[PDB]
């Protein structure tokens, strides 16, 4: 909670551009009713629901005719569910051995701007704000040569 | 300019009939509904009868249902009210009123222009 | 036959005459990050080398920014993105000369959606100059002193970034008598401008990629024409 | 079922007066559509307010209508000397249509 | 202005023209912004050519 | 064929099954064109291989 | 809970059935073997 | 309220005749649904036209219906010797349902 | 028009019994809404089943309702000694509202 520092020792080779995604465990959990729909989503998923009714107001008397004598609110059988992936990270940070490296960068910085500027045509920006990337080289795919690691 | 002057009322014996004729000038009488409203000398207003735009669809009040029969002639711009039977309660000033639809359509919601009023004075003497 | 009621944009009644019930919904302008940096210039002891406006930014958005990174730029400058949802199974038909099919809808929850309370928004506006394209053409920080390099931006007004949506609709029922007796119910907005609260610019920072170890200057101009 | 008005009030010139009309039994809903009429003596009654807050063309701005509590109220702000007349309230019951009050004689002193 | 049209008959005898209708419109109409072209014939003339 | 369904009751006493309904369809039905696949197994055989 | 706008798509172009179709500007590209590379463009003097 | 026809018309064989029926008061709206019936003497009446322009199966093509001005018209083009019969027009008034005319005896000379 | 019941049945304790009520003429549609009532002698009648299959709170699970053929059926499975009472079926005709049966005296042996 509020600080989750994780250290790894498997990474020994030099590291180029790195995609990281923090998927909630509830996304792939069995208890999720929308597990199958929201498994490939690295953000907190919620559902905005259209319930589009068919409203119709009918008057009978032909005399009072100001407030309708009857109405109707026929809803559709299947309501429309939009899955929203709210962001799961506020400030991402990647600290190196001796230097600060990535320190408290916002998730919108590492999820939107870094895919937008670094990568070229071969790397697109993901729609889900939870998925993000940390860059280490100026030319990720622009050339076949190590420009930083 | 616009007027709803009416006539045809006077002193009649109880249990009699009267013919109230209301004429209209310069306001396309065939397109606007006309109602008849009773005002007692000290008991306030009382709405009597309705005739619609065309001339059909006549609906009356509960106290004078069947007793009063209304009619309309758009050719000479006239509205007629027949008081077929009259008790002593019916002495009042009767107004022919122009009323179109705002919320309640056929009974009328906006009684725009009122006639000068004709005085029906029923008396056994 | 016309009867008028006051309804909220979601259909809730207002009971007209009641004080402090109508509150206007507020927009943001489309692409707030472009309109915020209305005029950007770079100065080295005066003598502005590069100077551009929001129109150059929206031009290079329309032309240079690819469609793969369109959602990234829309997230950076605070533009709403279309969230795609599904309705459910439907009857349908198959005419060849039956099958179950889902209906796909698109909806938006972003800044340009009119909201009663717009959340605090994160603008990440990229700065475009002649030396921001190629890493080989990046100017050194030691060739000229760092004190004399300055950036001047003209921020737009609050009225140029936030608009208002009508938070009140006059609902007109109308009973057209006859056979059939139609009941046309229409809605006309009641738009009276209010006082939007002052926007507080928080966490105003500039991110500079200071990495460790001929040119293409874009010349822009703006002209007004009436011939 | 009938509508009742009080017999009279008196108002000073330039003052504010509030005439009230009410059902004998029950509440005065906005669906009962109060309508207020003014009758100067020697003159036919005139439509002052219909549908509880709306005024036909020619009615002065000083007349206002409202529904307060369980009754309907006609408020005259800055009443002139021309307001000394008989004031009638009429409610639209569903079965009996318009039912009019006894009449309140407003006295302008 | 997508209305919700519904036609209801009352009599069970006449039943050819409906006895009532309804035209419930949505509160917010759908606005498509069309960018009609602004230029018919653009031209850029050089110094000599 | 998106209908505008609306169910209206008149009686105010029975009020369980509606006393009338309506199924107003749009004039122009929405036609999605679907391209089902045309080939099951494609094959291109060379001269010798 | 949350206030959300609804996004629709509509067409006003040539394929839309209209009572009166406006005059239309077709700009059809011509594709040949020499239209790809400027170095492979055939001379007008050969 | 009743519907009136002219009582007698004459048509030459192979000729066109236009029989008319009309309300006593008011117009003949298409919602009043004119229906034209043919009764050969010694035979029951047969439905020629219902709903002002439609023909049930077995009715010949020559009988056409229309509404002209403020009345309903039955047009027979190329009338044969089998059309010498009584012709009745019936209008569907809202309260009194079908009201039929007196009858026009079409004479084929 | 009336609803008819057989006058009496006998059931062993722990056994299943099917009581029938039917219209005199016509079928018992689900829109006629059968309602079954139990009246122990010396006690007021109690609502067992309304709308052919639903039970208000407090009714035991053993009373089930259905519509079989053109009649309504009350099935008691595992009837106890407390079910020896009068059972009334009521159908909601459109004009006459609820019409109740003569009464079945269920005997628990």
One-character DSSP codes across B40-81: -SSS-EEEEEEE-SSS---EE-STTBTTEEEEEETTTTEEEE
Q: CB A56 to CB F8 under 8 A?
A: yes
CB < 8 Å to A57, chain E: 22, 24
User: F13 vs chain I: nearest CA distance in angstroms?
Assistant: 9
Q: CB F16 to CB I31 under 8 A?
A: yes
Q: CB C177 to CB B103 under 8 A?
A: no
Residue I34, C-beta contacts closer than 8 angstroms, at least 6 positions apart: I21, I28, I49, I52, I65, I67, I72, I89, I90, I91
Contact B36, B60 (CB under 8 A): no
CB < 8 Å to A65, chain B: 101, 103-105
CB < 8 Å to B112, chain D: 47, 56
In a mutagenesis test of the I interface, which of F14, F15, F19 is the best target, namely the one with the most I β-carbons within 10 Å?
F14
Contact D45, D39 (CB under 8 A): yes
C-alpha distances (whole Å) from I107 to each of B61, C66, I42 are 60, 86, 16
Residue A46, C-beta contacts closer than 8 angstroms, at least 6 positions apart: A83, A84, A86
CB < 8 Å to C177, chain B: 101, 105-106
User: F29 vs chain C: nearest CA distance in angstroms?
Assistant: 11
D90 touches chain B (CB under 8 A): yes
Q: CA geometry: angle at A120 spanning A116 and A125, to 5°?
A: 35
C-alpha distances (whole Å) from A86 to each of A22, A44, C108, C202 are 12, 5, 13, 22
User: E47 vs chain G: nearest CA distance in angstroms?
Assistant: 27
Q: How many A×D Cβ pairs under 8 Å?
A: 6
CA atoms within 13 A on the CB side of B76: 7
Given its phi and psi angles, is residue D54 left (phi above 0), alpha (psi -120 to 50 degrees) or beta? beta
Look up residue D50 and give its DSSP letter. B
CB < 8 Å to G12, chain E: 34
Residue D89, C-beta contacts closer than 8 angstroms, at least 6 positions apart: D3, D5, D19, D21, D34, D35, D36, D37, D72, D74, D100, D101
- Three-state DSSP at E5 gives strand
Which among C208, C77, C185 is positioned nearest to C138, based on CA atoms? C208
- Three-state DSSP at A62 gives coil
The resolution, in angstroms to one decimal, equals: 3.5
Q: CB E30 to CB G12 under 8 A?
A: no
CA distance G5 to G26: 36
Phi and psi torsions of C3, nearest 5°:
-120, 130
Minimal-distance CA residue of chain E relative to A72: E6
Q: CB A63 to CB B104 under 8 A?
A: yes
Contact D105, D86 (CB under 8 A): yes
**Paired strand residues for B99:** B111
- Three-state DSSP at I81 gives helix
Which among B73, B65, B63, B92 is positioned nearest to B22, based on CA atoms? B73
Chains I and A touch (3+ CB pairs under 8 A): no
Which among C166, C160, C169, C151 is positioned nearest to C199, based on CA atoms? C160
CA distance A90 to A2: 10
Q: CB C169 to CB E25 under 8 A?
A: no
Which of residues 2 through 21 in chain B touch A, CB cutoff 8 A?
Answer: none
F30 touches chain I (CB under 8 A): no
Give the nearest partner residue to A55 out of E10, E20, E24, using CB atoms: E24
G10 touches chain C (CB under 8 A): no
Which among I49, I44, I52, I32 is positioned nearest to I95, based on CA atoms? I32
Residue H101: alpha-carbon gap to chain centroid:
9
Q: How many A×C Cβ pairs under 8 Å?
A: 91
CA distance C129 to C42: 9
* Total length of chain B: 125
CA distance B71 to C54: 74
Minimal-distance CA residue of chain A relative to C65: A116
- Dihedral of the CA atoms E10, E14, E16, E22 (nearest 10)? -20
Contact C118, C199 (CB under 8 A): no
Contact I93, I32 (CB under 8 A): yes
CB < 8 Å to G4, chain A: 48, 82
Residue C122, C-beta contacts closer than 8 angstroms, at least 6 positions apart: A106, A108, C78
Minimal-distance CA residue of chain A relative to D97: A64
Residues of D with CB under 8 A from a CB of C: 51, 53, 66
User: C42 vs chain G: nearest CA distance in angstroms?
Assistant: 38
CB < 8 Å to H33, chain E: 16
Which among B106, H32, B32 is positioned nearest to C177, based on CA atoms? B106
User: A72 vs chain E: nearest CA distance in angstroms?
Assistant: 10
- Which technique was the structure solved with, according to the deposited record? cryo-EM
* Total length of chain I: 109
CB < 8 Å to B103, chain C: 3
């Amino acid at each position: 909670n509020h600080h989750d520092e994780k250290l790894m020792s498997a990474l020994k080779w030099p590291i180029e551009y790195m995609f990281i995604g923090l998927k909630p465990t509830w996304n792939i959990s069995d208890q999720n009713p929308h597990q199958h729909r929201d498994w490939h989503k690295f953000g907190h998923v919620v559902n905005a629901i259209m319930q589009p009714t068919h409203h119709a107001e009918i008057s009978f008397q032909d005399r009072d005719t100001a407030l309708p004598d009857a109405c109707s609110s026929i809803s559709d059988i299947s309501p429309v569910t939009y899955p929203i992936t709210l962001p799961i990270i506020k400030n991402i940070s990647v600290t190196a051995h001796g230097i600060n490296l990535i320190d408290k960068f916002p998730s919108k910085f590492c999820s939107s701007y870094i895919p937008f500027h670094y990568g070229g045509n071969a790397i697109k920006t993901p729609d889900d704000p939870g998925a993000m990337m940390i860059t280490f080289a100026l030319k990720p795919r622009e050339e076949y040569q190590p420009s930083g690691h | 300019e616009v007027k709803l002057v009416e006539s045809g009322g006077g002193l009649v014996q109880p249990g009699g009939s009267l013919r109230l004729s209301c004429v209209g000038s310069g306001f396309t009488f065939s397109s606007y509904e006309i109602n008849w409203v009773r005002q007692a000398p000290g008991k306030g207003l009382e709405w009597l009868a309705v005739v619609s735009k065309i001339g059909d669809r006549t609906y009356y009040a509960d106290s004078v249902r069947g007793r009063l029969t209304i009619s309309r002639d758009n050719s000479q711009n006239t509205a007629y009210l027949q008081m077929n039977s009259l008790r002593t309660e019916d002495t009042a000033r009767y107004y022919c009123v122009r009323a179109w639809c705002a919320s309640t359509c056929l009974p009328g919601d906006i009684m725009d222009l009122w006639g000068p009023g004709v005085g029906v004075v029923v008396s056994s003497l | 036959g016309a009867v008028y009621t006051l309804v909220d944009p979601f259909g809730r009644p207002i009971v007209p005459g009641t004080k402090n019930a109508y509150r206007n919904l507020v927009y943001y302008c489309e692409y707030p990050g472009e309109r915020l940096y209305e005029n950007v210039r770079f100065d080295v002891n005066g003598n502005s080398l590069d100077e551009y406006s929001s129109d150059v930014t929206t031009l290079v958005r329309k032309f240079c920014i690819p469609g793969d990174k369109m959602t990234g730029y829309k997230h950076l400058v605070g533009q709403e993105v279309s969230v795609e949802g599904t309705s459910g199974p439907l009857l349908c038909n198959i005419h060849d000369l039956l099958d179950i099919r889902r209906n796909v809808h698109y909806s938006c929850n972003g800044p340009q959606t009119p909201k009663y309370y717009q959340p605090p928004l994160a603008l990440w506006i990229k700065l475009r100059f002649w030396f921001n394209e190629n890493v080989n053409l990046a100017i050194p920080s030691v060739s000229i002193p760092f004190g004399e390099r300055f950036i001047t931006i003209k921020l737009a007004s609050q009225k140029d970034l936030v608009n208002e949506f009508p938070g009140l609709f006059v609902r007109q029922s109308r009973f057209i008598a006859g056979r059939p007796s139609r009941r046309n119910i229409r809605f006309k907005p009641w738009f009276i401008p209010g006082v939007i609260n002052e926007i507080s610019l928080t966490n105003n920072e500039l991110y500079i990629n200071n990495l460790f170890v001929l040119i293409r200057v874009h010349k822009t101009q703006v002209t007004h024409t009436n011939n | 079922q009938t509508v009742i008005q009080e017999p009279a009030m008196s108002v000073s010139p330039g003052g504010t007066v509030t005439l009230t009309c009410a059902w004998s039994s029950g509440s005065v809903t906005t669906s009962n559509y109060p309508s207020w009429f003014q009758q100067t003596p020697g003159q036919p009654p005139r439509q002052l307010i219909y549908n509880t807050n709306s005024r036909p063309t020619g009615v002065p701005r000083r007349f206002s209508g409202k529904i307060s509590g369980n009754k309907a109220a006609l408020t005259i702000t800055g009443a002139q000397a021309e307001d000394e007349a008989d004031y009638f309230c009429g409610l639209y019951k569903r079965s009996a249509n318009n039912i009019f009050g006894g009449g309140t004689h407003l006295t302008v002193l």
